[PDB]
Amino acid sequence: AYTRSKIVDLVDGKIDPDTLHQMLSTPKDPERFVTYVEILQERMPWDDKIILPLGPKLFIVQQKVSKKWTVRCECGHDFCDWKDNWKLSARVHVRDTPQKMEEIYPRLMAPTPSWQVIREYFCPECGTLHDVEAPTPWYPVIHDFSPDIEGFYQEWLGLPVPERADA
Amino acid sequence: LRNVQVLGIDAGGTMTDTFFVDQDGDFVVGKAQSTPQNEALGLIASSEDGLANWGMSLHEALAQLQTGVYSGTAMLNRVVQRKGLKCGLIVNRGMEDFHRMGRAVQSHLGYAYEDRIHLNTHRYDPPLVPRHLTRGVVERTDMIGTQVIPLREDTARDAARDLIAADAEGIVISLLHSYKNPENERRVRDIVLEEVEKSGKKIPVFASADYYPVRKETHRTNTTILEGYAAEPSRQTLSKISNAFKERGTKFDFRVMATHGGTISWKAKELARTIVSGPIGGVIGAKYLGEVLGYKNIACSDIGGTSFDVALITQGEMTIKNDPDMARLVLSLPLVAMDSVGAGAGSFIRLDPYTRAIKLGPDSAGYRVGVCWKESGIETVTISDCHMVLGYLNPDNFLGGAVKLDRQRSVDAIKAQIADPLGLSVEDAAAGVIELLDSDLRDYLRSMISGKGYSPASFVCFSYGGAGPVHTYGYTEGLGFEDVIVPAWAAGFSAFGCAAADFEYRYDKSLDINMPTETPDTDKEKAAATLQAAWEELTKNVLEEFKLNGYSADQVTLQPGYRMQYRGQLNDLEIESPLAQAHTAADWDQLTDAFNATYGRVYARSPELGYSVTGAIMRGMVPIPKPKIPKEPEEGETPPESAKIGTRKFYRKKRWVDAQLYHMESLRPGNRVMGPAVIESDATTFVVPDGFETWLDGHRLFHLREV
Ligand SMILES: Nc1ncnc2c1ncn2[C@@H]1O[C@H](COP(=O)(O)O)[C@@H](O)[C@H]1O
Ligand SMILES: [Zn+2]
């Protein structure tokens, strides 16, 4: 196992080179998840329990009252049930023109909107960018991750599954 | 009555080794923890440990020495820890970025196989020269020296003025193909020198054509930057190391180890050649003995606490790698070739969690030894812990007993980490690891000799390092070596080899001579002229280096050389010129004949395709006091009873066996030791299981047989 501060440095991106190389070449520490979640928990402005981080500021949380599982932004905004695709309840900005493309790429280096489009999915409250898709036009919104939380907690970590209510 | 004459040092390994030898060939080996932040301390402590075995004080011995040689991490750490000057770089306009790009390869140099394919472990070290201290001149010379884009000198003046305004503490110049046609680069060199003079600032200039004129811009530019980045700072470090000895009595100028296996002054003009830290001294030491003993083909084996290093001396000569990489930098330095096989006797032993396979290294406990040292904090077993369980090592005699070892700690850690998971007894688990290690080393020696087109029967094996004599029986078994040799000074052989090295400067230049089999004399006349002109440019560099050290030309012994090959096929040998100079077509015929001779001697020949010269070599040697090799008359086959120092049980081939202990230094030339025995020293242990025999010759070299 690693020192808590080392895992904290990992999250904050301030870890030193020699430890990061260790983590990579040495066998994984089974205790990483429990410590990892706890580190993230004490940094949230809410006490709702994290049960799976989906991104730097996106989490599946247990609502402390209803006990439902929802996708939540670091600021506190709930998107939907954990089974649903949070993007469908978010805000999007699509760069489907050369004008929009050249705001993030130089010309010629930018994709061509008639072939590839860039979609930016934001949080409605704080405006954080949680995911960027780059599909062709017409393409469905991707449901990136459907985790098996019961089997993960129960069979792989040996932990009890958090209390869950139905949506 | 005792006169200590020579001192050899090697601080690049597990710790700081010192080797002292007197007028008769009598020796001591000192061992002490390294102190990289102030290497002087460990050098003094190590020397005091060795001289204590003679009953001598440091103060008394240093006044006697007439020469000494240092090898260690002084230069290496200065590069790795990036503690050099604010050196600047001038290259071709449009290619200012090729230095800091590291050619991509520098993001994974020195990585083990699994780390090399594990992408995320890849990582760039900071560039020696940052971008803001890099400038470019508009010029291009092609591969044959044709000036495609003539030099635009106004861009050189601006580049020079830019770096001077940035307070550059050095300016390196490296243009492409300057090794072919140095006209433009040396013109830029002069322009920089002028603008520096005008500015009144003291800024040295280094032109890659003047320092390392060889192919490969990335190698060459790195190697020249080291002269403007770490050279003078390294001089300061080596001044303190040599001042520490001088203010304590030494009356000689210290020499240091170079990549090419020769020693040079630490005030040399080119000190990038001192970045070497590995135990190449061990290869120079075995060669020095072979010359005196009559061994042309030697397989070197340095089993230390931090590394397993091996190398071959074939027909008296050793292989030189010409474009090596060191300190995660591609460099243009001729390096003595050694192969790393593992992480030393301190290599950690683990069971892969996904596979349960036994994994040695690649990290090592090193000076911390293993779990047997409670105060080290090592919680993971090491190969040394297997030596404790199995009974090869004496817990009460590790570094004379300076290290407090607990064998029971090894038994407990191996039981929980290796044996029980595999379902084995502790002894079988430990013995098994040693079995695995011996096979790796045995096969890697076999394959290496097989690569040169030889069988081990044509070779002799040298086993040194602190842990070499512990495994010699195991990884030499069945290979059929002509002779297996364990030097009585194995624990300091690498340091003995530094003192055995010549005082030898070496300079290299790249060439591209292409010669069909049969050609008119004029063509041969121009080939010799091209090589001769290169020799003349290198001879200047060699003799200048010696002139600064106080030696005149008539004191230097020049040995011209060149790298030649049958066109289309590469080789790993360098040829010593039969001629001090080449002018006629007949002289050229001698050089081609010399290669055919050397090629047939080492190794299949193909004179039909013609010949190619890819490089010229100049070496200059000055005689210096070298360690005397003992040559004592041999005594009785039976060792003195004073040499017997008890018995210890060790485990091998499913058998616990009572082994006779011997005090190595007490044994006499002629003595024969029949296994199972363990010949112990204070910093090395020589294992001789049953089915093996040893005898000691007049040079204090042990010979190992299987009977
Ligand atoms: N009496 C001894 N004292 C200390 N180290 C020893 C002794 N005998 C063998 N060694 C081995 O020598 C290794 C160090 O070798 P070296 O790196 O050449 O100094 C240690 O890791 C041990 O495995
Ligand atoms: Zn938000």
GROMACS .gro file of N, CA, C and O in nm, chain B residues 78-177:
model
  400
  245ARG      N    1   2.626   1.500  -1.178
  245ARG     CA    2   2.619   1.638  -1.225
  245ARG      C    3   2.530   1.651  -1.347
  245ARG      O    4   2.464   1.754  -1.365
  246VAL      N    5   2.526   1.549  -1.432
  246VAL     CA    6   2.436   1.550  -1.547
  246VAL      C    7   2.294   1.514  -1.505
  246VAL      O    8   2.197   1.582  -1.541
  247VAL      N    9   2.280   1.406  -1.427
  247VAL     CA   10   2.148   1.357  -1.391
  247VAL      C   11   2.074   1.460  -1.306
  247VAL      O   12   1.956   1.490  -1.330
  248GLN      N   13   2.141   1.515  -1.206
  248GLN     CA   14   2.081   1.616  -1.120
  248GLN      C   15   2.081   1.754  -1.184
  248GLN      O   16   2.045   1.851  -1.117
  249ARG      N   17   2.120   1.763  -1.312
  249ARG     CA   18   2.121   1.889  -1.385
  249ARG      C   19   2.178   2.001  -1.300
  249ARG      O   20   2.107   2.095  -1.262
  250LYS      N   21   2.307   1.993  -1.268
  250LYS     CA   22   2.374   2.096  -1.191
  250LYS      C   23   2.493   2.150  -1.269
  250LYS      O   24   2.605   2.158  -1.216
  251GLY      N   25   2.469   2.187  -1.394
  251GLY     CA   26   2.571   2.243  -1.480
  251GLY      C   27   2.542   2.389  -1.515
  251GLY      O   28   2.445   2.449  -1.472
  252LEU      N   29   2.632   2.444  -1.596
  252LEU     CA   30   2.627   2.585  -1.629
  252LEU      C   31   2.508   2.616  -1.720
  252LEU      O   32   2.441   2.526  -1.772
  253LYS      N   33   2.483   2.745  -1.739
  253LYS     CA   34   2.377   2.791  -1.829
  253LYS      C   35   2.433   2.796  -1.971
  253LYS      O   36   2.458   2.901  -2.030
  254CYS      N   37   2.452   2.676  -2.027
  254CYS     CA   38   2.511   2.662  -2.159
  254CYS      C   39   2.406   2.687  -2.267
  254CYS      O   40   2.289   2.650  -2.252
  255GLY      N   41   2.449   2.749  -2.376
  255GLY     CA   42   2.364   2.777  -2.489
  255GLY      C   43   2.400   2.690  -2.609
  255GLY      O   44   2.503   2.622  -2.612
  256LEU      N   45   2.314   2.695  -2.710
  256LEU     CA   46   2.326   2.607  -2.826
  256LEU      C   47   2.298   2.685  -2.953
  256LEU      O   48   2.200   2.761  -2.960
  257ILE      N   49   2.383   2.666  -3.054
  257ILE     CA   50   2.362   2.721  -3.187
  257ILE      C   51   2.359   2.604  -3.284
  257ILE      O   52   2.457   2.529  -3.296
  258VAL      N   53   2.247   2.587  -3.354
  258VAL     CA   54   2.230   2.480  -3.451
  258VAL      C   55   2.180   2.540  -3.582
  258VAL      O   56   2.191   2.661  -3.604
  259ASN      N   57   2.127   2.456  -3.669
  259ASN     CA   58   2.075   2.503  -3.797
  259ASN      C   59   1.937   2.564  -3.778
  259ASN      O   60   1.851   2.505  -3.712
  260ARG      N   61   1.917   2.683  -3.834
  260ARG     CA   62   1.786   2.747  -3.831
  260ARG      C   63   1.680   2.651  -3.883
  260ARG      O   64   1.698   2.587  -3.987
  261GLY      N   65   1.570   2.642  -3.810
  261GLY     CA   66   1.466   2.546  -3.841
  261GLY      C   67   1.477   2.416  -3.765
  261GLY      O   68   1.383   2.336  -3.770
  262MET      N   69   1.588   2.391  -3.696
  262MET     CA   70   1.606   2.269  -3.619
  262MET      C   71   1.645   2.298  -3.475
  262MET      O   72   1.706   2.214  -3.409
  263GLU      N   73   1.610   2.417  -3.426
  263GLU     CA   74   1.641   2.451  -3.288
  263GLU      C   75   1.583   2.351  -3.189
  263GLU      O   76   1.632   2.343  -3.075
  264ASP      N   77   1.482   2.274  -3.229
  264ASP     CA   78   1.411   2.186  -3.137
  264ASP      C   79   1.468   2.045  -3.129
  264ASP      O   80   1.423   1.968  -3.043
  265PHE      N   81   1.563   2.008  -3.214
  265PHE     CA   82   1.602   1.867  -3.219
  265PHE      C   83   1.676   1.823  -3.093
  265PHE      O   84   1.676   1.704  -3.062
  266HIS      N   85   1.737   1.915  -3.018
  266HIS     CA   86   1.804   1.876  -2.895
  266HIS      C   87   1.703   1.838  -2.787
  266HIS      O   88   1.711   1.730  -2.728
  267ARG      N   89   1.608   1.927  -2.759
  267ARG     CA   90   1.512   1.902  -2.652
  267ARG      C   91   1.410   1.795  -2.689
  267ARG      O   92   1.340   1.746  -2.600
  268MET      N   93   1.400   1.758  -2.816
  268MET     CA   94   1.310   1.651  -2.855
  268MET      C   95   1.366   1.515  -2.814
  268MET      O   96   1.294   1.416  -2.810
  269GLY      N   97   1.496   1.512  -2.784
  269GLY     CA   98   1.558   1.389  -2.740
  269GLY      C   99   1.544   1.274  -2.836
  269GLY      O  100   1.555   1.158  -2.795
  270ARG      N  101   1.517   1.302  -2.964
  270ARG     CA  102   1.501   1.200  -3.066
  270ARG      C  103   1.394   1.097  -3.029
  270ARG      O  104   1.390   0.988  -3.087
  271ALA      N  105   1.308   1.131  -2.933
  271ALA     CA  106   1.201   1.044  -2.885
  271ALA      C  107   1.254   0.931  -2.797
  271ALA      O  108   1.189   0.893  -2.700
  272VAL      N  109   1.372   0.877  -2.830
  272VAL     CA  110   1.419   0.757  -2.761
  272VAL      C  111   1.455   0.787  -2.616
  272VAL      O  112   1.448   0.698  -2.531
  273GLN      N  113   1.494   0.910  -2.586
  273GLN     CA  114   1.537   0.942  -2.450
  273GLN      C  115   1.422   0.943  -2.351
  273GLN      O  116   1.445   0.969  -2.232
  274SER      N  117   1.299   0.915  -2.395
  274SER     CA  118   1.186   0.902  -2.304
  274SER      C  119   1.174   0.762  -2.245
  274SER      O  120   1.088   0.740  -2.159
  275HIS      N  121   1.260   0.668  -2.286
  275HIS     CA  122   1.253   0.531  -2.236
  275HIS      C  123   1.390   0.463  -2.234
  275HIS      O  124   1.397   0.340  -2.243
  276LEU      N  125   1.497   0.540  -2.223
  276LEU     CA  126   1.630   0.482  -2.212
  276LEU      C  127   1.655   0.433  -2.070
  276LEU      O  128   1.614   0.496  -1.973
  277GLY      N  129   1.722   0.318  -2.059
  277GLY     CA  130   1.747   0.258  -1.930
  277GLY      C  131   1.628   0.187  -1.870
  277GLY      O  132   1.632   0.156  -1.750
  278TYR      N  133   1.524   0.161  -1.947
  278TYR     CA  134   1.405   0.095  -1.897
  278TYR      C  135   1.414  -0.056  -1.918
  278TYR      O  136   1.465  -0.102  -2.020
  279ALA      N  137   1.364  -0.131  -1.821
  279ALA     CA  138   1.347  -0.274  -1.838
  279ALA      C  139   1.235  -0.302  -1.938
  279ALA      O  140   1.150  -0.217  -1.964
  280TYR      N  141   1.236  -0.423  -1.993
  280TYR     CA  142   1.145  -0.456  -2.102
  280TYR      C  143   1.001  -0.417  -2.070
  280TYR      O  144   0.933  -0.353  -2.150
  281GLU      N  145   0.953  -0.455  -1.951
  281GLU     CA  146   0.814  -0.429  -1.918
  281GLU      C  147   0.786  -0.279  -1.907
  281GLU      O  148   0.676  -0.234  -1.941
  282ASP      N  149   0.883  -0.201  -1.860
  282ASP     CA  150   0.865  -0.057  -1.855
  282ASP      C  151   0.873   0.005  -1.994
  282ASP      O  152   0.813   0.110  -2.018
  283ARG      N  153   0.947  -0.057  -2.086
  283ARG     CA  154   0.960  -0.001  -2.219
  283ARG      C  155   0.829  -0.008  -2.296
  283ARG      O  156   0.795   0.085  -2.370
  284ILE      N  157   0.754  -0.116  -2.280
  284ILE     CA  158   0.624  -0.127  -2.346
  284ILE      C  159   0.512  -0.067  -2.264
  284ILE      O  160   0.405  -0.038  -2.319
  285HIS      N  161   0.532  -0.048  -2.134
  285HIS     CA  162   0.433   0.019  -2.049
  285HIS      C  163   0.444   0.168  -2.076
  285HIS      O  164   0.525   0.239  -2.017
  286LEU      N  165   0.361   0.216  -2.169
  286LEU     CA  166   0.379   0.350  -2.225
  286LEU      C  167   0.387   0.457  -2.116
  286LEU      O  168   0.479   0.539  -2.116
  287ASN      N  169   0.291   0.457  -2.024
  287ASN     CA  170   0.280   0.567  -1.928
  287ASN      C  171   0.403   0.581  -1.840
  287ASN      O  172   0.422   0.687  -1.779
  288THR      N  173   0.488   0.479  -1.830
  288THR     CA  174   0.613   0.495  -1.757
  288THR      C  175   0.712   0.584  -1.831
  288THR      O  176   0.808   0.632  -1.771
  289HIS      N  177   0.690   0.606  -1.961
  289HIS     CA  178   0.781   0.687  -2.039
  289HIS      C  179   0.781   0.830  -1.988
  289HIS      O  180   0.681   0.881  -1.938
  290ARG      N  181   0.895   0.896  -2.003
  290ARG     CA  182   0.914   1.026  -1.940
  290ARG      C  183   1.040   1.092  -1.995
  290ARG      O  184   1.143   1.026  -2.011
  291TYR      N  185   1.030   1.221  -2.024
  291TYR     CA  186   1.142   1.299  -2.074
  291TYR      C  187   1.212   1.369  -1.958
  291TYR      O  188   1.146   1.430  -1.873
  292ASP      N  189   1.344   1.361  -1.955
  292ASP     CA  190   1.419   1.446  -1.865
  292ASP      C  191   1.429   1.587  -1.923
  292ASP      O  192   1.419   1.605  -2.045
  293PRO      N  193   1.447   1.688  -1.839
  293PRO     CA  194   1.460   1.825  -1.891
  293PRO      C  195   1.579   1.836  -1.985
  293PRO      O  196   1.682   1.772  -1.963
  294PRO      N  197   1.568   1.916  -2.091
  294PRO     CA  198   1.682   1.932  -2.181
  294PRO      C  199   1.800   1.996  -2.111
  294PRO      O  200   1.785   2.079  -2.021
  295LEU      N  201   1.920   1.954  -2.152
  295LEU     CA  202   2.042   2.018  -2.102
  295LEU      C  203   2.041   2.167  -2.133
  295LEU      O  204   2.072   2.250  -2.047
  296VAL      N  205   2.006   2.202  -2.256
  296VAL     CA  206   1.996   2.341  -2.299
  296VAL      C  207   1.848   2.372  -2.321
  296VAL      O  208   1.784   2.308  -2.405
  297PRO      N  209   1.790   2.468  -2.249
  297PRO     CA  210   1.650   2.504  -2.274
  297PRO      C  211   1.634   2.576  -2.407
  297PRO      O  212   1.730   2.620  -2.470
  298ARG      N  213   1.508   2.590  -2.449
  298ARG     CA  214   1.480   2.650  -2.579
  298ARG      C  215   1.529   2.794  -2.585
  298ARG      O  216   1.590   2.835  -2.685
  299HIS      N  217   1.505   2.872  -2.480
  299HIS     CA  218   1.537   3.014  -2.484
  299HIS      C  219   1.687   3.041  -2.495
  299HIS      O  220   1.726   3.152  -2.531
  300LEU      N  221   1.771   2.942  -2.467
  300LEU     CA  222   1.914   2.952  -2.488
  300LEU      C  223   1.960   2.877  -2.612
  300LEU      O  224   2.077   2.840  -2.622
  301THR      N  225   1.869   2.854  -2.707
  301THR     CA  226   1.900   2.789  -2.834
  301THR      C  227   1.871   2.885  -2.948
  301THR      O  228   1.768   2.952  -2.948
  302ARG      N  229   1.962   2.891  -3.044
  302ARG     CA  230   1.946   2.976  -3.162
  302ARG      C  231   1.989   2.898  -3.285
  302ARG      O  232   2.046   2.789  -3.276
  303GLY      N  233   1.962   2.955  -3.402
  303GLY     CA  234   1.988   2.887  -3.527
  303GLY      C  235   2.050   2.979  -3.629
  303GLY      O  236   2.024   3.100  -3.631
  304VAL      N  237   2.133   2.921  -3.716
  304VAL     CA  238   2.194   2.991  -3.827
  304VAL      C  239   2.145   2.928  -3.957
  304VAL      O  240   2.118   2.808  -3.964
  305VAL      N  241   2.132   3.011  -4.060
  305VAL     CA  242   2.082   2.965  -4.189
  305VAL      C  243   2.199   2.907  -4.267
  305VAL      O  244   2.286   2.980  -4.315
  306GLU      N  245   2.201   2.775  -4.281
  306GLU     CA  246   2.307   2.705  -4.352
  306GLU      C  247   2.267   2.560  -4.365
  306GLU      O  248   2.196   2.506  -4.280
  307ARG      N  249   2.312   2.497  -4.473
  307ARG     CA  250   2.298   2.352  -4.486
  307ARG      C  251   2.410   2.296  -4.571
  307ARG      O  252   2.436   2.344  -4.682
  308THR      N  253   2.477   2.195  -4.517
  308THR     CA  254   2.577   2.117  -4.588
  308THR      C  255   2.525   1.974  -4.596
  308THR      O  256   2.474   1.921  -4.496
  309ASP      N  257   2.536   1.912  -4.713
  309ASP     CA  258   2.478   1.781  -4.732
  309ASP      C  259   2.577   1.673  -4.689
  309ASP      O  260   2.686   1.701  -4.639
  310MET      N  261   2.538   1.548  -4.709
  310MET     CA  262   2.611   1.433  -4.657
  310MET      C  263   2.753   1.418  -4.711
  310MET      O  264   2.837   1.356  -4.647
  311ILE      N  265   2.780   1.471  -4.830
  311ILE     CA  266   2.913   1.464  -4.889
  311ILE      C  267   2.986   1.597  -4.879
  311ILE      O  268   3.091   1.614  -4.941
  312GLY      N  269   2.934   1.692  -4.802
  312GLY     CA  270   3.000   1.818  -4.781
  312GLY      C  271   2.961   1.928  -4.876
  312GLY      O  272   3.009   2.041  -4.861
  313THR      N  273   2.875   1.900  -4.975
  313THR     CA  274   2.828   2.004  -5.065
  313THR      C  275   2.744   2.104  -4.987
  313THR      O  276   2.655   2.066  -4.910
  314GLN      N  277   2.772   2.232  -5.006
  314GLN     CA  278   2.704   2.339  -4.932
  314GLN      C  279   2.579   2.377  -5.009
  314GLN      O  280   2.581   2.463  -5.097
  315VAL      N  281   2.467   2.313  -4.974
  315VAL     CA  282   2.342   2.338  -5.044
  315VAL      C  283   2.295   2.481  -5.020
  315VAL      O  284   2.262   2.553  -5.114
  316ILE      N  285   2.292   2.522  -4.894
  316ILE     CA  286   2.257   2.659  -4.856
  316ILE      C  287   2.381   2.722  -4.795
  316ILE      O  288   2.419   2.686  -4.682
  317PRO      N  289   2.449   2.814  -4.864
  317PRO     CA  290   2.569   2.875  -4.806
  317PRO      C  291   2.539   2.944  -4.674
  317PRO      O  292   2.427   2.989  -4.649
  318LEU      N  293   2.642   2.952  -4.590
  318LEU     CA  294   2.626   3.013  -4.459
  318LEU      C  295   2.594   3.161  -4.472
  318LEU      O  296   2.664   3.235  -4.542
  319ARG      N  297   2.487   3.203  -4.406
  319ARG     CA  298   2.449   3.344  -4.399
  319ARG      C  299   2.501   3.398  -4.266
  319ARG      O  300   2.443   3.373  -4.161
  320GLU      N  301   2.612   3.472  -4.273
  320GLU     CA  302   2.686   3.505  -4.151
  320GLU      C  303   2.610   3.604  -4.063
  320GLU      O  304   2.631   3.607  -3.942
  321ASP      N  305   2.524   3.687  -4.122
  321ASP     CA  306   2.446   3.780  -4.041
  321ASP      C  307   2.359   3.706  -3.940
  321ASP      O  308   2.335   3.757  -3.830
  322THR      N  309   2.311   3.586  -3.975
  322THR     CA  310   2.232   3.508  -3.881
  322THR      C  311   2.317   3.448  -3.770
  322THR      O  312   2.263   3.415  -3.664
  323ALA      N  313   2.448   3.433  -3.792
  323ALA     CA  314   2.537   3.387  -3.687
  323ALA      C  315   2.566   3.498  -3.586
  323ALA      O  316   2.562   3.475  -3.465
  324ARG      N  317   2.596   3.618  -3.635
  324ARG     CA  318   2.620   3.730  -3.545
  324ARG      C  319   2.499   3.754  -3.456
  324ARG      O  320   2.514   3.776  -3.335
  325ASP      N  321   2.379   3.751  -3.513
  325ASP     CA  322   2.258   3.772  -3.434
  325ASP      C  323   2.240   3.661  -3.332
  325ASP      O  324   2.202   3.687  -3.217
  326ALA      N  325   2.266   3.536  -3.372
  326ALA     CA  326   2.254   3.425  -3.278
  326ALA      C  327   2.352   3.441  -3.163
  326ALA      O  328   2.316   3.426  -3.046
  327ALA      N  329   2.478   3.473  -3.194
  327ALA     CA  330   2.578   3.493  -3.090
  327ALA      C  331   2.539   3.607  -2.999
  327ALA      O  332   2.548   3.596  -2.876
  328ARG      N  333   2.495   3.719  -3.057
  328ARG     CA  334   2.454   3.833  -2.975
  328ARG      C  335   2.333   3.799  -2.889
  328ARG      O  336   2.320   3.851  -2.778
  329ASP      N  337   2.244   3.712  -2.938
  329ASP     CA  338   2.126   3.676  -2.860
  329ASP      C  339   2.165   3.600  -2.734
  329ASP      O  340   2.116   3.631  -2.624
  330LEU      N  341   2.253   3.501  -2.747
  330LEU     CA  342   2.291   3.420  -2.631
  330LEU      C  343   2.373   3.501  -2.532
  330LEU      O  344   2.357   3.486  -2.410
  331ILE      N  345   2.463   3.587  -2.582
  331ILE     CA  346   2.541   3.672  -2.493
  331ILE      C  347   2.449   3.764  -2.414
  331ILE      O  348   2.472   3.792  -2.296
  332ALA      N  349   2.343   3.814  -2.479
  332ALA     CA  350   2.246   3.897  -2.408
  332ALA      C  351   2.170   3.817  -2.304
  332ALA      O  352   2.124   3.872  -2.204
  333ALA      N  353   2.154   3.686  -2.326
  333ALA     CA  354   2.092   3.598  -2.228
  333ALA      C  355   2.191   3.550  -2.122
  333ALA      O  356   2.158   3.460  -2.045
  334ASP      N  357   2.311   3.608  -2.118
  334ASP     CA  358   2.412   3.573  -2.018
  334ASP      C  359   2.443   3.423  -2.022
  334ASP      O  360   2.458   3.359  -1.918
  335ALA      N  361   2.453   3.368  -2.142
  335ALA     CA  362   2.495   3.230  -2.156
  335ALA      C  363   2.635   3.212  -2.099
  335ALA      O  364   2.725   3.292  -2.126
  336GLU      N  365   2.652   3.107  -2.020
  336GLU     CA  366   2.782   3.073  -1.962
  336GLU      C  367   2.859   2.976  -2.051
  336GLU      O  368   2.962   2.923  -2.008
  337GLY      N  369   2.812   2.953  -2.173
  337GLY     CA  370   2.878   2.867  -2.269
  337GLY      C  371   2.796   2.863  -2.396
  337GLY      O  372   2.674   2.880  -2.392
  338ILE      N  373   2.861   2.842  -2.511
  338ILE     CA  374   2.793   2.841  -2.640
  338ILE      C  375   2.843   2.722  -2.719
  338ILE      O  376   2.960   2.719  -2.758
  339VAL      N  377   2.756   2.625  -2.743
  339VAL     CA  378   2.788   2.508  -2.824
  339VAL      C  379   2.736   2.531  -2.964
  339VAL      O  380   2.628   2.589  -2.983
  340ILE      N  381   2.811   2.484  -3.063
  340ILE     CA  382   2.776   2.498  -3.204
  340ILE      C  383   2.777   2.360  -3.267
  340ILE      O  384   2.877   2.288  -3.258
  341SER      N  385   2.666   2.323  -3.330
  341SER     CA  386   2.655   2.192  -3.394
  341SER      C  387   2.570   2.207  -3.519
  341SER      O  388   2.448   2.222  -3.509
  342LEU      N  389   2.633   2.204  -3.635
  342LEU     CA  390   2.564   2.205  -3.763
  342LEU      C  391   2.573   2.068  -3.827
  342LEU      O  392   2.667   1.992  -3.802
  343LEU      N  393   2.475   2.035  -3.910
  343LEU     CA  394   2.468   1.902  -3.968
  343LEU      C  395   2.585   1.878  -4.063
  343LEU      O  396   2.628   1.968  -4.136
  344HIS      N  397   2.636   1.756  -4.061
  344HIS     CA  398   2.743   1.712  -4.150
  344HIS      C  399   2.869   1.797  -4.136
  344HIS      O  400   2.950   1.805  -4.228
   0.00000   0.00000   0.00000
